[PDB]
Design an enzyme around this catalytic site. Structure first.
Site: not given
Ligand SMILES: Nc1c(C(=O)c2cccc(OC[C@@H](O)CO)c2)cnn1-c1ccc(F)cc1
Length: 344
Positions: A26, A164
């Site tokens: 993703v 982030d």
């Molecule tokens: N959890 C997320 C996202 C999201 O959840 C996210 C952000 C923007 C959009 C989004 O949509 C997903 C869809 O396109 C699919 O369902 C998710 C983006 N980065 N992280 C993240 C993961 C692990 C870490 F350690 C730190 C950060």
């Protein structure tokens, strides 16, 4: 130790506990090496981030430690927290990969609100949540430093999380990477404070209200000119705090301008929103409204609850001042992985 299985995803082998199923990439690279998955243990849709091998240098090893420490600390409804962290390694010697697991969000604020003006009620609720998260983050003496719509994630019920927490090139030109930055950080005027994030909130709030970028500068200097047209050129008091003598010297080359009337800029906006924006978009960071002060502003009267706006436990950042070897940062990181306790 759970059982791990292997799968080839982002041109690499992901080895993860069986509890995580239906892994799917993703973000198209925009969040790192991140796969969506279903966590069969919790029933949550999650994001799993595999760090791009995290101990390649001292700088990268310390950054890995920093990210894990930060994510482990954050326990708040409006801030991304850690659901799980794991490694397939069975010992410190074998340790070379770190996987971070968080809630999967629906979309970022940017791709949702881009070019669109929101209703006042929706702006109230979105900005309230950002401020509620920021009060928490700031209470731990953490500064985000890079708040912008693309690192604000929302779900279907408008519930928001801050995530982030850059190179010179990616901050150059007509770029959203710089449009939300406080002028003192954009131009390295001084040692900055927590209210750099409040500047950013002001920029975001303005854009939600108008559907337009507040300070869409074509470069750093163009952006500064847009900012000073709105908020006025600095007085002697602020000039003295610009410890950079070259920066201070350039400012005094500019023709003086008074602060604009924000009611004539944000035409038709709720007067309380205008008032809050005037308190957030103050040039002198010493005089900007704080997150805790902003939450008590009349604009948030329908959401504000001082008994439901928690602060963070203290956060020890002494490691930042420390110069260690790769293997030392790696051992510290390993200790944090193996000591992780999941949330309720
Ligand atoms: N959890 C997320 C996202 C999201 O959840 C996210 C952000 C923007 C959009 C989004 O949509 C997903 C869809 O396109 C699919 O369902 C998710 C983006 N980065 N992280 C993240 C993961 C692990 C870490 F350690 C730190 C950060």
């Amino acid at each position: 130790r759970p059982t791990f299985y292997r799968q080839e995803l982002n041109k690499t082998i992901w080895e993860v506990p069986e509890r995580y199923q239906n892994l799917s990439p993703v973000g198209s690279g925009a969040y790192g090496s991140v796969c969506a998955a279903f966590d069969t243990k919790t029933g949550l849709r999650v994001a799993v981030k595999k760090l791009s091998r995290p101990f390649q240098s001292i700088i990268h090893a310390k950054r890995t430690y920093r990210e894990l420490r930060l994510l482990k600390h954050m326990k708040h409804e409006n801030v991304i927290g850690l659901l799980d962290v794991f490694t397939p390694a069975r010992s410190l010697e074998e340790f070379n990969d770190v996987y971070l697991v968080t809630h999967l969000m629906g979309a970022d604020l940017n791709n949702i609100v881009k070019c669109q003006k929101l209703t006042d009620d929706h702006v109230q609720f979105l900005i309230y949540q950002i401020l509620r998260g920021l009060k928490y983050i700031h209470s731990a003496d953490i500064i985000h430093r890079d708040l912008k719509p693309s690192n604000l994630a929302v779900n279907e019920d408008c519930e928001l999380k801050i995530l982030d927490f850059h190179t010179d090139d990616e901050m150059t030109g007509y770029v959203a990477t710089r449009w939300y930055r406080a002028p003192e950080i954009m131009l390295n005027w001084m040692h900055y404070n927590q209210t750099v994030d409040i500047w950013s909130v002001g920029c975001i709030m303005a854009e939600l209200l108008t559907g337009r970028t507040l300070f869409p500068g074509t470069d750093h200097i163009d952006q500064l000119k847009l900012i000073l047209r709105l908020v006025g050129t600095p007085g002697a008091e602020l000039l003295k705090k610009i410890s950079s003598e070259s920066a201070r010297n350039y400012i005094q080359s500019l023709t003086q301008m008074p602060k604009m009337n924000f009611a004539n800029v944000f035409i038709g906006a709720n007067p309380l929103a205008v008032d809050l924006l005037e308190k957030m978009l103050v040039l002198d960071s010493d005089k900007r409204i704080t997150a805790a002060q902003a939450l008590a502003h009349a604009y948030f009267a329908q959401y504000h609850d001082p008994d439901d706006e928690p602060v963070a436990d203290p956060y020890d950042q002494s490691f930042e001042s420390r110069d260690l070897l790769i293997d030392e940062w790696k051992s510290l990181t390993y200790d944090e992985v193996i000591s992780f306790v999941p949330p309720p």
